[PDB]
Design a protein around this ligand. Structure first.
Ligand SMILES: NC(=O)NOCc1ccccc1
Ligand SMILES: NC(=O)NOCc1ccccc1
Ligand SMILES: [Zn+2]
Ligand SMILES: [Zn+2]
Ligand SMILES: [Zn+2]
Ligand SMILES: [Zn+2]
Lengths: 360, 360
């Protein structure tokens, strides 16, 4: 069986399990079940499944080098599929809630869930809650008797909590820290003193890298009973590094990729986000350029937005990007080498994750 | 040590643990830590702590009849306090998110969290997420080596998921089920065919009873290693029964308790909620009364709201309430008796929970 067709099949099986349980154990009626089926499909399907498929790809790597009965091979692959859906549903939770938090309009060429006419914010906040609850229902059902259940739940928790803390770093990134105060409406920064590489790195490390790269890699090791084939400090280091690069690319596309190709209208400039572009621009600007940036950033006025894009264009940010990219290629190849000492197979899976990131 | 002073002390200890970890493990800065300290205090403190204190009271019951070293007595009580805070933080999560979902203005005489000037919806949805993540952090830290960790996590999950499903039942209670559809804006019901006792019971069972009554009772049994002192089908039956009564009282106060005493302006009529009052009124109304109710319910116009209150007044709903109350007194005393067969101590704790509910 090809990997993607297995993965997709297990989605149908998990969906049926979750909705059947709603009827047998939680007293749901058929119409509300249909509403939740449609919510699940709309929010969990239609991406490339990079995160969930990484679990499967890691587990396939280890199957090629480890002796097992066929039925054990099938159970491992079924577990890797379930685990990969846990991650896809976790991402679904964060996309639904973030879209509401940020007042987003589109995602992937389609309206954000909360904007569907028979959804609304009142339902969509709760639908998002349900998405994440379903990850837990999956784990407790499919992994009830598994030796890795404890470790898997404990890892999942920490990643989820890191991700929520990262959303906090993200949404407060344009405020002055010393002015955070629940009692006082928050002004945009005027000095941009906090738009630094180290601060930017903390936002991206927490908001994206834990659930996009660390979790799929480590879940693949857990369902394979292979955590001893790695030095977990290296896996964490490589995960954060690759995931930082992934976000830098996303930051650049938000500004420069046309909307029909991007699948939405990017608003990072208007939203005054601490993007890689803003931070890099500030790291090389002269006094007059910094003043012009300050007079135009974080404003909805499209002429002021065009002024910011113009500043980024004139500033030759493509060169700082190629230099960044060069250095990440360097450090990732180094980390992969360190991974080969305990597991060529795992190092190869990390290689594949890097290639899919670097070339998308 | 008195129970409440222990409980309160453990809040300070848990808070310090959670914020210290944010600094040592999640790279937080002092200002964001202060923001989260204030969020925790504002959202978790100021109620009566009925749910968390019930864990402690159940555990105290068993301590009186079970032999233990003093250090074991202290560990059980510390565990019951932590467990009771897990429940209080879980309720905090649902209050923050529900207030946003329902566009609530006040809670307990104070603005809803999302309405604080330096919060806003964009932060408050995520703050609510964090609240529930903190319940998990507590359990994995304080109960890491405990024999009941698995059972406690598995119970907590199911209760949380029941609660989210109950919010779904609640927010869709004024729609016709056969018309639920993410693609189509949802009209209010015109026939009110779904305002029935059984439908009402399903909303309340899921939305409130699992986290308010089942969870504190069962968590008390788990931290005491006492689940064998009960027949879990009875505990579930009594929990749902008491919790249904609790919500019927809440439904009546939303309509009839003055706002300064209620701590908010009740809007169940304007929001077309399936309340006990609406369902009971419809169960006894003549044709003309049903037509007048239909012409006035679910409308913000205060004259139409006063028409609905007038219908409920003339309909002598206080008599149906006294009759309901009588029957619940009857069934609860019966269930307590059945609980005495395996545990007088546990039956007594259930007695106390009932008294606090019945007389508030
Ligand atoms: N639906 C129902 O009544 N019970 O299923 C959920 C559940 C919650 C807590 C403890 C055990 C089960
Ligand atoms: N903050 C950090 O870098 N690590 O702490 C969180 C964490 C997440 C996943 C696995 C293990 C730990
Ligand atoms: Zn966002
Ligand atoms: Zn972006
Ligand atoms: Zn509500
Ligand atoms: Zn109410």
């Amino acid at each position: 069986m090809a990997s993607m067709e297995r993965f997709l099949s297990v989605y149908d099986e998990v969906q049926a399990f979750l909705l059947d349980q709603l009827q047998s154990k939680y007293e749901i009626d058929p119409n509300r079940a249909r509403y939740l089926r449609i919510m699940m499909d709309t929010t969990c399907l239609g991406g490339k499944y990079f995160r969930g498929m990484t679990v499967v790809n890691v587990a396939e790597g280890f199957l090629a080098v480890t002796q097992h009965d066929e039925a054990t091979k099938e159970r491992i692959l079924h577990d890797a599929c379930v685990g990969g859906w846990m991650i896809e549903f976790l991402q679904a939770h964060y996309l639904v809630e973030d879209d509401i938090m940020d007042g987003s309009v589109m995602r992937r060429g389609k309206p954000c869930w909360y904007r569907f006419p028979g959804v609304t914010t009142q339902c969509a906040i709760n639908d998002g809650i349900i998405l994440k609850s379903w990850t837990q229902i999956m784990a407790w059902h499919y992994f009830a008797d598994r030796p890795f259940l404890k470790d898997l739940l404990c890892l999942f928790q920490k990643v989820d909590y890191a991700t929520a803390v990262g959303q906090m770093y993200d949404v407060t990134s344009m405020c002055d820290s010393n002015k955070l105060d629940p009692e006082v409406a928050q002004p945009m920064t005027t000095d941009f003193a906090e738009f630094t590489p180290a601060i930017y790195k903390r936002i991206v490390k927490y908001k994206t890298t834990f659930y996009t790269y660390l979790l799929p890699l480590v879940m693949g090791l857990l369902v394979s009973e292979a955590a001893a084939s790695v030095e977990m400090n290296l896996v964490e280091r490589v995960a954060h590094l690759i995931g930082e690069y992934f976000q830098v690319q996303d930051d650049v596309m938000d500004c420069f990729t046309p909307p029909e190709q991007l699948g939405k209208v990017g608003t990072d400039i208007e939203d005054a986000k601490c993007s890689w572009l803003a931070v890099t621009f500030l790291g090389k600007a002269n006094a007059a350029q910094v003043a012009e940036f300050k007079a135009n950033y974080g404003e909805k006025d499209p002429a002021k937005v065009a002024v910011v894009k113009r500043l980024y264009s004139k500033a030759n940010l493509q060169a700082d990007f190629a230099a960044y990219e060069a250095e990440v290629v360097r450090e990732v190849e180094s980390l992969i080498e360190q991974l080969k000492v305990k597991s060529p197979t795992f190092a190869e899976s990390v290689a594949v994750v890097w290639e899919k990131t670097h070339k998308r």
